[PDB]
Homo-oligomer: 151 residues x 12
C-alpha cells in the first residue's frame, strides 16, 4: 500500500507497533490465565478472561492492519514479541484474584502505550489516532470489569 506520506506511515508504525506487541502478548498470556485460573469465581473469570483475549486479538489485528495499510511491515513474530514484552501472569495454577492482578498489570502497560499513540498521532494522523482511541475505549472497559472484582 504505497503511499503519499512516508511521515504518516512512519508515525503510525512508531506509535502503533508497541500496541500490536502488547495486545498480541495479552492474547497469549490471557490464555495462560484463562487455563490456569482457580478458586471460587472460576467459571465467571475463566469466561471474562476469554473475552479479554478475544478483544486483545481484535485490537492487535486492527492496529497491525492500520500499519500495513499505510505501506510498512510489522514484525510480530513470537521471538520479537517476547523481546518487547513482559507479563506478570503466573507460570501455573493461581487463584483468580492473582490472575486478575497480573492481567490488569499487563493491561496498565498497554494503556501507557495507547496513550502515547493518542498524543503522538494527534498532530500527524488523525485516522491512525482514531484506531488507538478505539482500542483504548475497549481496553479501559476490560480493565474496569477485571478490577471491579477486587474493590
Amino acid at each position: 500500500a504505497l503511499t503519499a506520506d512516508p511521515e504518516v506511515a512512519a508515525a503510525a508504525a512508531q506509535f502503533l507497533t508497541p500496541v500490536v506487541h502488547k495486545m498480541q502478548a495479552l492474547v497469549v498470556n490471557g490464555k495462560q490465565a484463562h487455563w490456569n485460573v482457580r478458586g471460587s469465581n472460576f467459571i465467571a473469570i475463566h469466561e471474562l478472561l476469554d473475552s479479554v483475549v478475544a478483544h486483545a486479538q481484535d485490537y492487535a489485528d486492527t492496529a497491525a492492519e492500520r500499519i500495513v495499510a499505510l505501506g510498512l511491515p510489522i514484525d510480530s513474530r513470537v521471538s520479537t514479541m517476547a523481546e518487547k514484552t513482559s507479563t506478570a501472569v503466573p507460570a501455573g495454577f493461581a487463584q483468580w484474584q492473582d490472575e486478575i492482578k497480573a492481567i490488569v498489570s499487563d493491561i496498565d502497560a498497554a494503556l501507557v502505550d495507547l496513550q502515547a499513540a493518542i498524543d503522538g498521532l494527534d498532530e500527524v494522523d488523525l485516522t491512525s489516532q482514531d484506531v488507538a482511541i478505539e482500542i483504548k475505549r475497549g481496553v479501559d472497559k476490560d480493565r474496569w470489569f477485571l478490577l471491579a472484582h477486587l474493590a
Copy 2:
C-alpha cells in the same frame, strides 16, 4: 488415579500447546505481511489456519488442565520452546506458505509423538492429539497445494 498418567499426557501435549499457540502468533504475522498476486485468498486462508491453531491450542491445554496439571504457556516460555521461519517483514505469498508449512511440519512431529506415546498411557488424551492431527494435516494440504505449481 495414577499421577504419572496425567504427567506423561502433559509431557506429550505441552509441545502441542506451545507450537499451536505460536502458530496463532506467527500465522497472524504472515496474514498481515503477505503480498502478491494471491493476496486476498492467502490472507484469508492464513486467518483460518490461525483460528484452527487457537482452537487446537485451547483443546490440548484444557486436556492437560482437566487432567489436573498446570500449563506454562506464557509468552516467555513459548518463545524459548518454539522458533518460526515466517519472515520478519513483507514477503510474497509463496514464501509465507513455505514458512507456515515448515512450522506445521514441526508441529506434526510432536503430534505424531503424542499419538504414538499416548497409545500406552491414555487413549482419551490420544484422541485429542488425533483430532488436532486431522485438522492440521488438512490445513497443510490447503497451503501446500498452492505450490504443486
Copy 3:
C-alpha cells in the same frame, strides 16, 4: 452382526447410559436447590452439565440400539442401578459441586472400564466412550476448579 460385538457394547455402554441419565435428574435437582454467593454461575454451570449428560446418555443408548440390542433405561431400572450424593433440599454451592463431582467420578469409572473393555472388540463403540469421557473430564474440571484453596 458379530453377536459378541453387540453384547460387549451393551455390557460396557449400559452403565454409562444409566449414570448419564441419572446425572440429568440429579443435576437438575442440584440446579434447583443450589444457594449462596455463587448461585447464578453454578446454577447455569449445572444446567450445562445436565445438557451434556443428556446428550451423552443418548449417544451411548443409540449406539447400543444401532448395534441391535434393547436398552432398559426406565425410571425404575435406573434407580436400581444408580446412587446420588445430591442433597434432598437446599444446599450451598460448594456442597452441590462436591455431590455432582462425586456422581461424575462414578461415571468416570464406568467410562474408563468401557474404554478398556471395548479395545479389542469394537473400536467404534470405544470411540463413543472416549468422546463421552473427554466431555465428562472437562465438566469435572469446571466444577472442581471452584474448590481450589
Copy 4:
C-alpha cells in the same frame, strides 16, 4: 403463611416428579421404538421429552422461587412415579399407549393443581395451566395416530 408457599409445593411437586419421570421414560420409548412409523414417532417422542423437561423446570422453579426446596432426586422420583413404558423394543403403537398412560396420570395431577391453587395462588395456578395446555396438545399428537 405463606401457607401459600406450602400449597405450591403440595400441588406442584407431583407435577415435577411426573414430568421429570416422563423425560426418562420418554427417552426410553424414543430409543426402543420400532416399526412402520419409526422416524415420525422417534422424533415426536423427542419433542415430548423436551417439553416435559421444560415443564418440570418451570414447576420446580416456581416452588423454589416461593422459598421451599424440592426433592427430585432419582430415588424420590422413582418412589413417587410408575411407568408402563416397556423394558425393551416395542412397536410404535405400544410406545404411544404407554406414553399416553404416563401423560394421563400427569394430567390428573395438573388438574388437581389447577383446582387446588384456585383459592390460594393464581400465579402458581397459572404455571399448572400453562403446563396442562402443552401436555394436552402432546397427548393429541400422540393419540391421533391410533384413531387410527
Copy 5:
C-alpha cells in the same frame, strides 16, 4: 364498552408501570455501580432484571392504552410515585442485591393488589399482572439466592 373495566385496569396497572419503569432506571444505576467479588455475574444479572422490567412496564402500559386510557409515566410523575433503596454511588454486590430486592418487594405488593383487584373485573388484564408477577418472583429468587446462608 363498560368504562369501569378500563378504569380498573388503569387503577391497578398504573403502579405496576411506575415501579417497573423505575426498576429499569434504578437497576441500571446498580448495574453501573456494583463492585466486589461477584461483579461480572451480578452486573449481568442486573442487566437481565432491567430488560425484564422494561418489557413488563411496556406490557402493563399498553394494556392500559389498549383499553382506551392514557398513562402518565413521564420522569417527573414516576419520581413522585416511586422511591429506591439503590445507593447513590459504588456499592458492594450484596448491598445492591438487597436494595433491588427491596424495590422488587414493593412492586410485588402492587402486582398482588392488581391480581386481587382485577379478579372480578377483567380477567384479561388480570393475566397481564399474573405474567409480570411470575417473572418478577423468579428474578427475585435469582437475586436473593446469592444471599442465602
Copy 6:
C-alpha cells in the same frame, strides 16, 4: 498510574449526558405509548428506536465514567432533579409528540456539544464517546423532524 483530575473532569462533562439520555428512555416510552393520529404506527415504531438508542447512549456514557473510576448517581430521584420534559401527560397527536421529543433532544445536544468542546483538552477517548453519541442523536433528530418539514 493515571491523572485523577482527567477522570474527574471527564465525569463532569458526561454525567449530564447520562441523565438526559436515561430521561429520554422514560419520556420516549411515555410518548411511544400515548401517541395518536394518522401516523401512529410509523411514529410509535420510530419512538421505540429512539428509546433503544437513548438507552445504549446512557449505558456507554455511564460506563465510560465508571471505567475512569468514578461513580455515577443516576437514581430516579436524581435524574428527575436534573431533567425536565416537554412530553405531554396523556394522549397527544403524533406532531406534538415529535416536537416534544425534539425539544428534549435539543437540550441533550447542548450537553453533548459542551462535552465535545470541553473534552478536547481533557481526554480524547472520552471525547470520542460523546462524538459517537452526538452522531446518533443528530440522526434521530432529523428522522423525527423531517416529518414536520411539511
Copy 7:
C-alpha cells in the same frame, strides 16, 4: 386393535371448548381472509404502513385460529371450519374493491369488535368449567385487543 386410551378424555370439558371456541375459530379464520382482502386493496397516504400492519393482523389471526381450533380438537371433538361453514357463520364490512386506508381500518376494527364479543363470551363461559381453555381465550383476547388499538389509534382524535 384395540380399543384403548379414550381420545376425548373429558367429554363435558370438550363440549365447553367446542361450544365457546368454535365461534373464535370462524371469526379468526375469516379475519385472515378479509384481512388479506384489505391488505391487497388498501390505497392512500398511509399505504405502506397500513399494508404491513394488516399483514401482521392477518398473521396473528391465523395463529389464534390455529390455537383455538387445536384446543378443541385436542380435547376430542371435531371443528367444522370449511369455507362454506365459515361463510355461513361470519360476515365482513371490508369493501369489495379499492378503499382508502381509513375505511379499511374501520372495516377491520368492526370485524375485530364482533370477534371480541365472542372472546369475552368464551372467557365468561369457560370460567367455571375449564380454566385451561379459558386461558386460550384470554391469550387471544390480549393480542386482539392490542391489534385493535394499533389500527384504531390511527383515527384518533
Copy 8:
C-alpha cells in the same frame, strides 16, 4: 387496461382457489387422524403456507396492474367448493380431498398460462411459478396413496 383485464380474468380464479385452500387445508390439518397423523398434519401445514403465498402473489399481480380483487369470504365461498370433510377423517381421505381441490386449482392455472401467453408474459410467469409449486405439493400428497 387490456393487460390489467387479462390478469384479472385469469388470476382471479387462482386467488380464490389458493385462499380457499388455506382455509380448507387448515380444516384438513386440524381434523386429520390415523397412522400417519404427524407427517400428514405437518405436510398439510406446508401446503397451506404455500397456498397463502400463491394467493398473495397472484392477488398483488392483479392489483399492481391497476384492478381490484374481491376476495372477501362471502365471494370466495360463492366461487369455490371443497371435498374436505366436515369433521374427523382418516389421513387417506384428507389427502384425496385436498388433491381434489388442488386438481381444480390446476385447471385454472393451466387456463391462466394458455390465456396470458399472447398477452402478458410477466403475469404468465406468476401463473407458471404457482403451478410449479402446486404440482410439487400434489405429488407429495398423492405419492402416499401410490400404495
Copy 9:
C-alpha cells in the same frame, strides 16, 4: 451463432443503465425526502434502491455470462439516462412521482426486452420478466400512496 449474445446485449443494456441510475437517483430521493410520511417513504425508497441494484447486477451478468462487455461507467450511464428526481429537498408526494417517472421509463425498456428476446433467447427473456415483475410491484407500492 453470435447473434444470441448480441441481442441480449442490445435489449438488456438499457435495463442495466436505467436500474443502475435508479440506485443513484433513488438514493437521492431517499436522502432528500421531507414531510408527514418521511420514515415510511425513506424506508420504501431504500428497498427500491436495493432491488434496483439487484436488477442491474442480474442483467449485466446475464450479458457478460453470454460473452460480451458492458459499459456501465458513470459517464456512459449519465449519457444514457435522465431523472425527474429534484436536486434538493422535496415533499414525499413529489419524490414518489419523480421515481415513478424513472420506473415508467425502465418499464418501456423491460417490455421491449421481453418482446425483443421472445424469438431469440428465452433465457435472457426470463431475466427481463423477473426484473419486470419486481419493478411492477415497486411501482404499485409507490403509486398506491397517491391514489388518495
Copy 10:
C-alpha cells in the same frame, strides 16, 4: 525419513469408502425421487438425510487421502466400475427402497470395518476417519431398518 506406506495404506483402505459413499449419494437420490407409498414423506426426507451424510463421508475420506499426498480417482466411470446398487430403476414402495439402501450400506460397512482393522497398525489418524464415518453410517442404518422391525 518420511514414509510412503502410511499414505499408500490410507489410499488402499479409504478409496473403497469414497466410491461407496459417493455412489450412495447418487443411488440414495434415486430412491429419494422414486419412493412411493404410505410413508412417503418421512422416507423421502430420511433418504435426503442419508445422502447429505454420505456426501460428507465421501468428502471426508477423499480429502484424507489427498491430504496425505495421493490422488483419488472418483470419476463417474470409475465409481460405476467399483460399485453396485440394489436400488430399483423406477418407482418402488418405501419398504423396498429401505431394503435396497440398507443393502448398499451393509456393503459399505464391510469396507469401513476392513479400513478400521487395516489401519490399526499403520495410521490411527486415518483409522479415526473410518471410525467417525462408521458411527454415522451404523446409525443411518438403524434409522432405516427400524421401520421394518414391524
Copy 11:
C-alpha cells in the same frame, strides 16, 4: 385425464439434464479434491459451489419428471452409460480442471437448450425448470471460464 404428452415430453427433455447434473456433482467433486497450483483455494471453493448448484438442478429437474407421474432411472450404472467426463483421473492443475469442467457444462447446455426448445410447444411449466437451470449453469460457466481470459 392429464395429457400423456406433457409427462412424456418432460421425461424426454429433462432426463438427460438430470444425468448430466448428477454426473457433474460426482466429477465436480473429483475436480475439487484433485485440483492443484497457484489458485488452489479459490478454485477448490468455486468447484464446491458448482457441485452444490448441480445437485440442486438435478433434484429440480428429476422432481419435475416425477411430479408429472413418470419414474426416472438415475442409478450410478445408468448415469455412467449415459454420460462422460474430461475431468482427469488424478492430480491436475487448476487450469485443466477448469477446462474439463467447462467441457462437461457445455454438453449439459446443449441438452438444456434442446429442452427449452422442445418444451416450448408442450409444457411451459417444465420449460421454466430448464430455463432456470440454464440461467444458473450459464453463470457458473462464466465464473469458471473468466479465469482463462488470462
Copy 12:
C-alpha cells in the same frame, strides 16, 4: 451557527460524489474483470462497492441531518467525477489499478475533509475519519495484489 452545516456540506459533498461514483464504477469493474484471479477480485470488488455505498449514505445523511440538501443526481455526480475503469473487459491487474486510482482521488477529498472540519465540527470530522479508515484498508487489499 449555520456555518457548521455549511462546512459539512462543503467538505462532505465531494465525499458523497466520489463514493457514490465508486459504487457504479466498482460494479463496472466487478462485471468486466477477467484473468487468473477472477473470482477473488470479482468478490473483492463487490465488497469495495458495498463499503462505498455505505460510506456515501453516511456522509450524505450527515449533511442532511445538519439541515442541508445534497444534489447527488446521476447528472451532477457525473459532472463532478472521473473514472479510469475501462469501458469493457479488462485483466484483473488493470481493474485494480483503475479502482485504486479512483480510491486515491477519494482519499484527497477525505483528507481535505478531515483537515477542513478540524476547527469547525468534530462530529462531521469523525464521519470522514471513519470513512477514511475503511477506504485505506480497501486500497491495501487491492494494491497488495500488485506488490508482485
